[PDB]
Amino acid sequence: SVTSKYLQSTFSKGNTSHIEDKRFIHVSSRSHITPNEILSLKFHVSGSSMAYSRMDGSLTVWFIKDASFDKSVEVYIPDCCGSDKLATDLSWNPTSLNQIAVVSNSSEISLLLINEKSLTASKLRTLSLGSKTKVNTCLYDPLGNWLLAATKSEKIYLFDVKKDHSSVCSLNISDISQEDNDVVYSLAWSNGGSHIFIGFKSGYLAILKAKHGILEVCTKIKAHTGPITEIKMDPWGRNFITGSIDGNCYVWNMKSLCCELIINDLNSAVTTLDVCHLGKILGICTEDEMVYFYDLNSGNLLHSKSLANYKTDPVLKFYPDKSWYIMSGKNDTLSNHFVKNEKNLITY
Amino acid sequence: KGPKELESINASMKSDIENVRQEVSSYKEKWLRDAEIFGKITSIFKEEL
Amino acid sequence: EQYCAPDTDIRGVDAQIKNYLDQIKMARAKFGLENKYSLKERLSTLTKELNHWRKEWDDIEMLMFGDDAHSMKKMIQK
């Protein structure tokens, strides 16, 4: 019951700060409009940086140095990756401390090294592929050993990041799916780059081996009856969580690959999910503008809330180095959460 | 910090400096060759302009 | 383990413990002092030079791409 009180305190009068971004001051001036979006938001591994990209085209990055974003510098940058094209996915390159990979639904993958002394985001390199190929998702092996780029259909590329991003291998999606017109919806890496978990739209789930740089199909299981939205992994490495649009959220055992626990209070589709860095609490953002916080070990609801028709598409992410979580606010504005006197659950 | 981790990170920094020097020399040679070719081509353009 | 030995005396073993401790401190401090200064300076300088050289190479590649685009421009001219 300690975790329930902790979450309640994290939802209190204080212990909360508004992330002061461009959209925040925009709403402050125009309220005291059509909300663009938040395409994606992804931390650095060491828990001391953050990056995200709205629909306008501008990607913000913060260098966390304070709790309530007091002394946190902010490198705002205009619509990068072209003037017409906007960013859709980014990976933070766990190898170094500054590099970033960004994709813009085009045939060009941009590698930019963000600098913190100035506000200059200088394009370091651009990678290109076949002219028709339209990739939109990039990922980094959590050891910084492989890079993955995926299309909505009929292309999957793996580069070796060590040897100057030499194109290592590729694969046609129709060889992985073997169904009628499947479109990969979400990808994820295993803890320590050894396997790639892919969730198609027709419902299937595939596990590809990427040991020595040669992709191969290990297995395919008919997990869900609708498109798979998100795929997350437990940090301790014992189970991986699958959330779908048919209203189900399962947790699969890693050693044996069989369903072990099911979330049953759900009655709506899932838009995203996330699990804390301690592998203890599981946050589900359903489609009825509502968030839930479940317990991983037992599987019973321990906290609920209600978005109340503010920023229809929400986002949730748990810090990789503290028990804090960034959650969307009212009008596409981010809202930090903490307790200001508890860095981790154990200290509580 | 501990002595084992100290020696480990020292060896890692040494290897990183070595690899960085090697890659920097390689990239410098490549950029020099490409810039030489580009200047050989652009000599006529500069003479015309 | 030499403490609970049958014939050994305590004072000599305590002295050996003192010597071991001093050796550990000395080795750790020497390695740390060597690792910090010179390695940090050299790594920073080499990193800056490598970034500059990679930027120059990317500029040369951009010039080659510009020549390739000028080819298509001259083709459109016809």
Short mmCIF file of C-alpha atoms in Angstrom, two decimals:
data_model
loop_
_atom_site.label_atom_id
_atom_site.label_comp_id
_atom_site.label_asym_id
_atom_site.label_seq_id
_atom_site.Cartn_x
_atom_site.Cartn_y
_atom_site.Cartn_z
CA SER A 1 0.00 0.00 0.00
CA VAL A 2 3.09 2.21 0.03
CA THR A 3 2.96 2.55 -3.75
CA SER A 4 -0.66 3.71 -3.71
CA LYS A 5 0.14 6.49 -1.24
CA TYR A 6 3.21 7.41 -3.29
CA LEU A 7 1.13 7.76 -6.46
CA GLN A 8 -1.54 9.74 -4.62
CA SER A 9 1.12 12.13 -3.35
CA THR A 10 2.45 12.43 -6.91
CA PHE A 11 -1.05 13.67 -7.87
CA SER A 12 -1.33 16.32 -5.15
CA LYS A 13 -1.71 20.12 -4.96
CA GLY A 14 2.06 20.66 -5.00
CA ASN A 15 4.67 18.20 -6.26
CA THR A 16 3.99 19.22 -9.88
CA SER A 17 5.58 21.66 -12.34
CA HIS A 18 4.58 22.81 -15.82
CA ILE A 19 7.26 22.23 -18.45
CA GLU A 20 7.71 25.72 -19.89
CA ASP A 21 7.97 25.21 -23.66
CA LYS A 22 6.95 27.31 -26.65
CA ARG A 23 3.42 25.88 -26.70
CA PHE A 24 3.07 26.58 -22.98
CA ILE A 25 3.75 30.31 -23.28
CA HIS A 26 1.67 30.34 -26.46
CA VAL A 27 -1.37 29.02 -24.58
CA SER A 28 -0.61 31.35 -21.67
CA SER A 29 -0.71 34.35 -24.00
CA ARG A 30 -3.73 33.25 -26.06
CA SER A 31 -5.78 32.15 -23.03
CA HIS A 32 -5.09 34.49 -20.09
CA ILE A 33 -6.28 27.08 -31.07
CA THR A 34 -5.78 23.87 -33.02
CA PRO A 35 -3.23 21.81 -31.05
CA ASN A 36 -0.62 20.49 -33.44
CA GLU A 37 0.62 17.23 -31.84
CA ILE A 38 3.44 15.55 -29.99
CA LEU A 39 4.79 13.07 -32.53
CA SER A 40 7.26 11.43 -30.14
CA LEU A 41 9.20 11.92 -26.90
CA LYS A 42 12.21 9.85 -25.82
CA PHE A 43 14.69 10.19 -22.95
CA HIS A 44 18.40 9.63 -22.89
CA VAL A 45 19.47 6.44 -21.16
CA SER A 46 21.31 8.17 -18.32
CA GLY A 47 18.14 10.06 -17.37
CA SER A 48 19.70 13.51 -17.85
CA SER A 49 18.23 14.63 -21.19
CA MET A 50 14.89 14.70 -22.98
CA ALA A 51 13.75 15.23 -26.55
CA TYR A 52 10.43 15.46 -28.36
CA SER A 53 8.94 16.68 -31.62
CA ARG A 54 5.66 18.50 -32.15
CA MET A 55 3.71 18.49 -35.41
CA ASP A 56 4.86 21.99 -36.38
CA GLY A 57 8.27 20.52 -37.20
CA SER A 58 10.33 21.87 -34.31
CA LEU A 59 11.99 19.44 -31.91
CA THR A 60 12.77 20.54 -28.38
CA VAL A 61 15.47 19.03 -26.19
CA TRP A 62 16.07 19.70 -22.50
CA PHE A 63 19.20 19.13 -20.44
CA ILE A 64 17.67 18.17 -17.09
CA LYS A 65 19.57 19.82 -14.26
CA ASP A 66 16.68 20.68 -11.93
CA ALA A 67 13.43 19.20 -10.68
CA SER A 68 10.93 21.86 -11.79
CA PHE A 69 12.92 22.86 -14.91
CA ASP A 70 14.42 25.90 -13.19
CA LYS A 71 18.02 25.77 -14.44
CA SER A 72 17.31 23.36 -17.30
CA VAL A 73 18.66 24.81 -20.55
CA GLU A 74 16.54 24.33 -23.67
CA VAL A 75 17.90 24.07 -27.21
CA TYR A 76 14.89 25.06 -29.30
CA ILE A 77 15.41 24.52 -33.02
CA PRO A 78 13.18 25.27 -36.05
CA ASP A 79 11.70 22.69 -38.42
CA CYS A 80 14.69 20.39 -38.89
CA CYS A 81 14.96 17.64 -41.50
CA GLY A 82 13.75 19.94 -44.27
CA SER A 83 11.21 22.74 -44.31
CA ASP A 84 8.38 20.68 -45.81
CA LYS A 85 9.13 17.48 -43.86
CA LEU A 86 8.55 16.96 -40.14
CA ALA A 87 10.12 14.49 -37.71
CA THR A 88 8.30 11.31 -36.70
CA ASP A 89 10.77 9.26 -34.64
CA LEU A 90 14.13 9.71 -32.94
CA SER A 91 16.67 7.60 -31.04
CA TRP A 92 19.23 8.90 -28.59
CA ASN A 93 22.28 6.75 -29.43
CA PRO A 94 23.27 5.27 -26.04
CA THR A 95 26.89 5.10 -27.24
CA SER A 96 27.80 8.78 -26.92
CA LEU A 97 26.31 11.64 -24.93
CA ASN A 98 25.08 13.93 -27.72
CA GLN A 99 24.26 12.16 -31.00
CA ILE A 100 20.67 11.77 -32.18
CA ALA A 101 19.04 9.88 -35.04
CA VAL A 102 15.87 11.37 -36.52
CA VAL A 103 13.57 10.14 -39.30
CA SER A 104 11.04 12.23 -41.23
CA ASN A 105 8.88 9.71 -43.16
CA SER A 106 11.36 10.09 -46.02
CA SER A 107 14.35 8.25 -47.49
CA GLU A 108 16.82 10.24 -45.38
CA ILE A 109 17.94 9.49 -41.82
CA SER A 110 19.54 12.49 -40.14
CA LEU A 111 22.27 12.15 -37.50
CA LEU A 112 22.69 15.41 -35.59
CA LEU A 113 24.95 16.17 -32.65
CA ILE A 114 23.21 18.60 -30.31
CA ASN A 115 25.47 21.10 -28.53
CA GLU A 116 24.69 22.54 -25.09
CA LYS A 117 27.06 25.53 -24.91
CA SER A 118 25.30 27.29 -27.78
CA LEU A 119 21.80 26.55 -29.09
CA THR A 120 23.13 25.07 -32.34
CA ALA A 121 21.95 21.67 -33.55
CA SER A 122 24.44 20.92 -36.32
CA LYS A 123 23.68 18.23 -38.87
CA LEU A 124 26.50 15.70 -38.59
CA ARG A 125 25.50 13.21 -41.28
CA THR A 126 22.69 12.04 -43.55
CA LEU A 127 22.03 8.43 -44.55
CA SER A 128 20.12 7.50 -47.70
CA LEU A 129 18.55 4.39 -49.22
CA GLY A 130 16.41 3.40 -52.20
CA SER A 131 14.45 6.26 -53.70
CA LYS A 132 11.01 4.72 -53.16
CA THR A 133 11.79 3.51 -49.63
CA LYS A 134 9.93 5.58 -47.02
CA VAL A 135 11.18 4.66 -43.53
CA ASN A 136 9.56 6.20 -40.46
CA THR A 137 10.97 4.49 -37.34
CA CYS A 138 14.52 4.33 -36.02
CA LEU A 139 15.85 2.44 -33.01
CA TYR A 140 19.11 1.83 -31.18
CA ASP A 141 20.29 -1.38 -29.54
CA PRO A 142 20.38 -0.59 -25.80
CA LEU A 143 24.12 -1.30 -25.89
CA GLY A 144 24.69 0.95 -28.90
CA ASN A 145 25.67 -1.90 -31.22
CA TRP A 146 22.98 -1.98 -33.93
CA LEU A 147 20.57 0.50 -35.50
CA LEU A 148 17.18 -0.43 -36.95
CA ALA A 149 15.11 1.46 -39.52
CA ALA A 150 11.66 0.30 -40.57
CA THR A 151 9.09 1.18 -43.21
CA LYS A 152 5.33 0.92 -43.16
CA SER A 153 5.78 -1.90 -45.68
CA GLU A 154 8.41 -3.99 -47.44
CA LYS A 155 11.67 -2.74 -45.94
CA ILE A 156 13.67 -3.36 -42.74
CA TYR A 157 17.28 -2.18 -42.48
CA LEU A 158 19.92 -2.88 -39.84
CA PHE A 159 23.15 -0.87 -39.69
CA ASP A 160 26.26 -1.59 -37.64
CA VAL A 161 26.79 1.59 -35.63
CA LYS A 162 30.34 0.65 -34.64
CA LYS A 163 31.79 0.54 -38.17
CA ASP A 164 30.59 4.00 -39.26
CA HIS A 165 27.00 2.88 -39.90
CA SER A 166 27.90 0.47 -42.68
CA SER A 167 24.71 -1.06 -44.06
CA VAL A 168 24.73 -4.51 -42.48
CA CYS A 169 21.50 -6.11 -43.68
CA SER A 170 17.91 -5.73 -44.87
CA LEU A 171 14.73 -7.78 -45.15
CA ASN A 172 11.40 -7.64 -46.98
CA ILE A 173 8.44 -7.38 -44.62
CA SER A 174 6.38 -9.77 -46.76
CA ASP A 175 8.87 -12.47 -45.76
CA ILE A 176 8.19 -11.80 -42.07
CA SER A 177 4.40 -11.42 -42.16
CA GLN A 178 3.23 -13.89 -44.84
CA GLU A 179 -0.30 -12.49 -44.55
CA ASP A 180 -2.61 -10.16 -46.47
CA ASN A 181 -1.35 -6.56 -46.46
CA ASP A 182 0.25 -6.21 -43.04
CA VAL A 183 1.73 -2.92 -41.80
CA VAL A 184 4.22 -2.96 -38.93
CA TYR A 185 2.78 -0.88 -36.10
CA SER A 186 5.41 -0.96 -33.33
CA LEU A 187 8.91 -2.33 -32.82
CA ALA A 188 11.06 -2.82 -29.74
CA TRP A 189 14.47 -4.19 -28.77
CA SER A 190 15.30 -6.84 -26.22
CA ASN A 191 17.42 -6.01 -23.18
CA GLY A 192 20.83 -6.28 -24.77
CA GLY A 193 20.58 -6.38 -28.53
CA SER A 194 19.93 -10.01 -29.36
CA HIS A 195 16.35 -10.10 -30.66
CA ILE A 196 13.86 -7.73 -32.29
CA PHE A 197 10.17 -7.87 -31.35
CA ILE A 198 7.80 -6.76 -34.12
CA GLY A 199 4.04 -6.20 -33.92
CA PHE A 200 2.13 -6.21 -37.18
CA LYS A 201 -1.37 -4.90 -37.79
CA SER A 202 -3.11 -8.19 -38.60
CA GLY A 203 -2.47 -9.28 -35.01
CA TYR A 204 0.65 -11.45 -35.35
CA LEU A 205 3.79 -10.94 -33.29
CA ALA A 206 7.23 -11.91 -34.58
CA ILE A 207 10.61 -12.46 -32.94
CA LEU A 208 13.61 -11.94 -35.20
CA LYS A 209 17.18 -12.94 -34.36
CA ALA A 210 19.82 -10.27 -34.99
CA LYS A 211 22.82 -11.88 -33.31
CA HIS A 212 25.69 -11.41 -35.77
CA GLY A 213 24.11 -8.94 -38.19
CA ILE A 214 21.99 -11.33 -40.27
CA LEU A 215 18.25 -11.05 -39.70
CA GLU A 216 16.25 -14.27 -39.44
CA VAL A 217 12.73 -15.30 -38.44
CA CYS A 218 12.76 -17.19 -35.15
CA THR A 219 9.04 -17.49 -34.38
CA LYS A 220 5.62 -15.94 -34.91
CA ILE A 221 2.72 -16.20 -32.46
CA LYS A 222 -0.88 -15.09 -33.02
CA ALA A 223 -0.95 -12.84 -29.99
CA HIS A 224 -3.91 -10.53 -30.48
CA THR A 225 -7.08 -10.14 -32.53
CA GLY A 226 -6.47 -6.50 -33.39
CA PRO A 227 -3.52 -4.28 -34.25
CA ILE A 228 -0.79 -4.19 -31.62
CA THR A 229 -0.21 -0.66 -30.39
CA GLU A 230 2.78 -0.81 -28.03
CA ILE A 231 5.40 -3.31 -26.87
CA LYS A 232 7.41 -2.67 -23.71
CA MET A 233 9.98 -4.73 -21.82
CA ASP A 234 10.55 -5.18 -18.11
CA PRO A 235 13.87 -3.74 -16.90
CA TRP A 236 14.71 -6.82 -14.84
CA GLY A 237 14.34 -8.99 -17.94
CA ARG A 238 11.75 -11.57 -16.94
CA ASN A 239 8.60 -10.61 -18.87
CA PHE A 240 7.61 -8.44 -21.81
CA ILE A 241 4.33 -6.52 -21.91
CA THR A 242 2.07 -6.34 -24.96
CA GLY A 243 -0.78 -3.86 -25.33
CA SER A 244 -3.30 -4.00 -28.16
CA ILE A 245 -6.23 -2.06 -29.58
CA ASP A 246 -8.76 -4.83 -28.88
CA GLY A 247 -8.73 -3.81 -25.21
CA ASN A 248 -6.30 -6.41 -23.85
CA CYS A 249 -2.98 -6.00 -22.08
CA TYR A 250 -0.98 -9.18 -21.54
CA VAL A 251 2.39 -9.83 -19.95
CA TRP A 252 4.32 -12.71 -21.51
CA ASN A 253 6.93 -14.72 -19.64
CA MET A 254 10.32 -14.32 -21.27
CA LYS A 255 11.87 -17.74 -20.67
CA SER A 256 8.92 -19.80 -21.91
CA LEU A 257 6.91 -17.42 -24.15
CA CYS A 258 3.46 -18.04 -22.67
CA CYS A 259 0.85 -15.69 -21.26
CA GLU A 260 1.14 -15.26 -17.50
CA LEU A 261 -0.97 -12.27 -16.46
CA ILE A 262 -3.86 -10.40 -18.06
CA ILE A 263 -5.37 -7.00 -17.33
CA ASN A 264 -9.14 -7.48 -17.18
CA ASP A 265 -10.63 -4.20 -15.92
CA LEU A 266 -9.88 -2.68 -19.33
CA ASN A 267 -12.81 -2.07 -21.67
CA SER A 268 -11.26 0.22 -24.29
CA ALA A 269 -8.36 0.45 -26.72
CA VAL A 270 -4.79 1.20 -25.64
CA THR A 271 -2.85 4.14 -27.09
CA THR A 272 0.39 3.72 -25.12
CA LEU A 273 1.86 2.17 -21.99
CA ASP A 274 4.99 2.32 -19.85
CA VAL A 275 6.56 0.57 -16.86
CA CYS A 276 8.76 2.21 -14.22
CA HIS A 277 12.50 1.66 -14.07
CA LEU A 278 11.97 -0.69 -11.11
CA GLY A 279 9.56 -2.97 -12.97
CA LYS A 280 6.85 -2.44 -10.35
CA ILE A 281 4.07 -0.18 -11.68
CA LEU A 282 2.45 -0.29 -15.11
CA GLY A 283 0.78 2.78 -16.60
CA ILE A 284 -1.89 2.32 -19.27
CA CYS A 285 -3.30 5.18 -21.35
CA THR A 286 -6.54 3.92 -22.86
CA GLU A 287 -8.54 5.53 -25.67
CA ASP A 288 -11.40 6.94 -23.57
CA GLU A 289 -9.08 9.71 -22.29
CA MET A 290 -8.22 7.95 -19.05
CA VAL A 291 -5.06 6.63 -17.40
CA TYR A 292 -4.66 3.64 -15.11
CA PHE A 293 -1.84 2.53 -12.83
CA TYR A 294 -1.64 -1.22 -12.18
CA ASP A 295 0.74 -3.33 -10.13
CA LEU A 296 2.97 -5.65 -12.15
CA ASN A 297 3.33 -8.41 -9.56
CA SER A 298 -0.32 -8.86 -8.56
CA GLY A 299 -2.32 -7.42 -11.46
CA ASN A 300 -4.93 -5.40 -9.55
CA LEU A 301 -5.79 -1.75 -10.15
CA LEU A 302 -4.08 0.56 -7.69
CA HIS A 303 -4.79 4.02 -9.09
CA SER A 304 -7.08 5.67 -11.65
CA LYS A 305 -7.50 9.17 -13.05
CA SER A 306 -9.32 10.98 -15.86
CA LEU A 307 -7.88 13.16 -18.62
CA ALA A 308 -11.30 14.87 -18.97
CA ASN A 309 -11.11 15.76 -22.68
CA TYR A 310 -7.87 17.75 -22.41
CA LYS A 311 -5.25 16.94 -25.08
CA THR A 312 -7.16 13.93 -26.58
CA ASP A 313 -3.93 12.10 -27.53
CA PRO A 314 -1.94 11.66 -24.28
CA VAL A 315 1.66 10.59 -23.66
CA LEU A 316 3.27 8.91 -20.65
CA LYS A 317 6.90 8.12 -19.87
CA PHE A 318 8.66 7.07 -16.67
CA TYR A 319 12.13 8.40 -15.91
CA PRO A 320 14.95 5.90 -16.55
CA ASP A 321 16.78 7.00 -13.38
CA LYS A 322 14.09 8.12 -10.90
CA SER A 323 10.48 7.32 -10.05
CA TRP A 324 9.11 10.41 -11.82
CA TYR A 325 6.99 10.52 -14.96
CA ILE A 326 6.27 13.11 -17.63
CA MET A 327 2.59 13.26 -18.57
CA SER A 328 0.67 15.46 -20.98
CA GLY A 329 -1.44 18.28 -19.59
CA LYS A 330 -4.38 20.30 -20.90
CA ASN A 331 -3.53 21.59 -24.39
CA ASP A 332 -0.57 19.55 -25.67
CA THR A 333 1.49 20.91 -22.76
CA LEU A 334 3.74 18.63 -20.75
CA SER A 335 3.36 18.30 -16.98
CA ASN A 336 6.14 16.87 -14.84
CA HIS A 337 5.40 14.97 -11.63
CA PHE A 338 7.48 14.24 -8.53
CA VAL A 339 7.44 14.20 -4.72
CA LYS A 340 10.52 16.42 -4.28
CA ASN A 341 11.72 14.31 -1.33
CA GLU A 342 11.86 10.76 -2.76
CA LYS A 343 14.30 10.00 -5.58
CA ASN A 344 13.30 6.33 -5.72
CA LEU A 345 10.54 4.10 -4.38
CA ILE A 346 12.97 2.30 -2.05
CA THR A 347 13.81 5.54 -0.24
CA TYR A 348 10.09 5.85 0.50
CA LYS B 1 36.33 5.01 -7.15
CA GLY B 2 37.81 1.52 -7.10
CA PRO B 3 41.22 0.60 -8.51
CA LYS B 4 39.89 -2.05 -10.90
CA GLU B 5 37.33 0.33 -12.39
CA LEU B 6 40.04 3.00 -12.52
CA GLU B 7 42.39 0.82 -14.56
CA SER B 8 39.46 -0.26 -16.75
CA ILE B 9 38.37 3.28 -17.60
CA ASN B 10 42.00 4.31 -18.12
CA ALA B 11 42.54 1.51 -20.64
CA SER B 12 39.21 2.41 -22.25
CA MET B 13 40.21 6.07 -22.60
CA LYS B 14 43.57 5.04 -24.07
CA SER B 15 41.92 2.77 -26.65
CA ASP B 16 39.37 5.48 -27.44
CA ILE B 17 42.11 8.07 -28.01
CA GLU B 18 43.93 5.61 -30.27
CA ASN B 19 40.85 4.78 -32.36
CA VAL B 20 39.90 8.47 -32.54
CA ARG B 21 43.37 9.37 -33.81
CA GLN B 22 43.23 6.61 -36.43
CA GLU B 23 39.75 7.55 -37.67
CA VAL B 24 40.66 11.25 -37.68
CA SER B 25 43.73 10.55 -39.82
CA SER B 26 41.64 8.44 -42.21
CA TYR B 27 38.92 11.08 -42.53
CA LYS B 28 41.53 13.81 -42.98
CA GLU B 29 43.15 11.87 -45.82
CA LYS B 30 39.76 11.27 -47.46
CA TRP B 31 38.72 14.92 -47.15
CA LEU B 32 42.11 16.01 -48.51
CA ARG B 33 41.77 13.78 -51.58
CA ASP B 34 38.18 14.86 -52.24
CA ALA B 35 39.04 18.54 -51.75
CA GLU B 36 42.00 18.19 -54.12
CA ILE B 37 39.71 16.74 -56.79
CA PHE B 38 37.12 19.45 -56.12
CA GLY B 39 39.73 22.19 -56.42
CA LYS B 40 41.09 20.69 -59.64
CA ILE B 41 37.54 20.86 -61.01
CA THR B 42 36.76 24.33 -59.64
CA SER B 43 39.98 25.91 -60.95
CA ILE B 44 38.34 26.38 -64.36
CA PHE B 45 35.19 27.76 -62.72
CA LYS B 46 37.21 30.32 -60.75
CA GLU B 47 39.17 31.29 -63.86
CA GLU B 48 35.91 31.81 -65.75
CA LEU B 49 34.25 33.79 -62.95
CA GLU C 1 44.02 -16.20 7.05
CA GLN C 2 47.49 -15.84 8.53
CA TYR C 3 45.84 -14.46 11.69
CA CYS C 4 44.45 -17.81 12.86
CA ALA C 5 47.69 -19.57 11.96
CA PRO C 6 49.27 -21.63 14.77
CA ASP C 7 52.73 -20.09 15.05
CA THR C 8 52.21 -16.58 13.64
CA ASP C 9 52.31 -13.43 15.78
CA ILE C 10 49.76 -10.63 15.58
CA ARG C 11 52.06 -7.60 15.37
CA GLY C 12 53.81 -8.69 12.17
CA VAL C 13 50.51 -9.41 10.47
CA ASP C 14 49.17 -6.01 11.51
CA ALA C 15 52.26 -4.46 9.93
CA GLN C 16 51.63 -6.43 6.74
CA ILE C 17 48.05 -5.14 6.73
CA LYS C 18 49.33 -1.57 7.02
CA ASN C 19 51.72 -2.14 4.12
CA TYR C 20 48.98 -3.65 1.95
CA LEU C 21 46.69 -0.72 2.70
CA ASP C 22 49.36 1.81 1.76
CA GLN C 23 50.13 -0.05 -1.47
CA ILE C 24 46.44 -0.04 -2.42
CA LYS C 25 46.08 3.68 -1.75
CA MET C 26 49.23 4.46 -3.74
CA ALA C 27 48.28 2.37 -6.78
CA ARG C 28 44.72 3.70 -6.91
CA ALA C 29 45.89 7.31 -6.58
CA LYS C 30 48.58 6.92 -9.23
CA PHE C 31 46.17 5.40 -11.74
CA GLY C 32 43.52 8.04 -11.06
CA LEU C 33 45.94 10.95 -11.39
CA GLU C 34 47.32 9.55 -14.64
CA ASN C 35 43.87 8.78 -16.06
CA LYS C 36 42.28 12.15 -15.32
CA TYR C 37 44.46 14.92 -16.77
CA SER C 38 46.32 13.67 -19.83
CA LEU C 39 43.60 11.32 -21.02
CA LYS C 40 40.88 13.97 -20.71
CA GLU C 41 42.93 16.59 -22.57
CA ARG C 42 43.98 14.26 -25.39
CA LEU C 43 40.48 12.80 -25.77
CA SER C 44 38.90 16.25 -25.99
CA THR C 45 41.42 17.52 -28.56
CA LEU C 46 41.20 14.38 -30.70
CA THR C 47 37.39 14.46 -30.56
CA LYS C 48 37.30 18.07 -31.73
CA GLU C 49 39.74 17.36 -34.57
CA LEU C 50 37.77 14.27 -35.62
CA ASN C 51 34.50 16.21 -35.67
CA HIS C 52 36.09 18.93 -37.80
CA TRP C 53 37.55 16.40 -40.25
CA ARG C 54 34.21 14.59 -40.52
CA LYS C 55 32.51 17.93 -41.21
CA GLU C 56 35.03 18.63 -43.98
CA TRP C 57 34.42 15.18 -45.48
CA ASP C 58 30.65 15.74 -45.35
CA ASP C 59 31.17 19.08 -47.09
CA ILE C 60 33.18 17.39 -49.86
CA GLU C 61 30.42 14.79 -50.23
CA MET C 62 27.87 17.61 -50.41
CA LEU C 63 29.94 19.20 -53.19
CA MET C 64 29.95 15.90 -55.08
CA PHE C 65 26.17 15.70 -54.65
CA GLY C 66 25.96 19.27 -55.94
CA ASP C 67 27.89 18.24 -59.04
CA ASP C 68 25.51 15.29 -59.48
CA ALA C 69 22.57 17.70 -59.23
CA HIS C 70 24.23 20.06 -61.72
CA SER C 71 24.31 17.10 -64.10
CA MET C 72 20.51 16.83 -63.87
CA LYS C 73 20.26 20.62 -64.19
CA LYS C 74 22.21 20.56 -67.47
CA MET C 75 20.03 17.65 -68.58
CA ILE C 76 16.91 19.75 -67.91
CA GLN C 77 18.57 22.58 -69.85
CA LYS C 78 18.27 20.49 -73.02
#
